[PDB]
Design a protein around this ligand. Structure first.
Ligand code: NA
Ligand code: NA
Lengths: 26, 26, 24, 24
């Protein structure tokens, strides 16, 4: 349960960092 | 560049934690 | 900024994972 | 164990993000 929730959190952080990486490019 | 690579790393950690969460269940 | 807030998030998760390791 | 190694990974990334924040 707790590890699955933390896994989803880390996936979401990954998407947030990718969006920041993109905004920096554009 | 570096943020995109770290984003991929965090996605991969997410899959590793999800696999650990699963192994624990089964 | 925003990256610092994410960095703190990751350090919080690291503490949670260490706690889970020792829970079982 | 394995979770501790991932926790250390996350603390390493947190330091990288803090460095990127201050790079620019
Ligand atoms: Na979650
Ligand atoms: Na990578």
């Amino acid at each position: 349960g707790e590890l699955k929730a933390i896994a989803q959190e880390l996936k979401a952080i990954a998407k947030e960092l990718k969006a920041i990486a993109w905004e920096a490019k554009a």
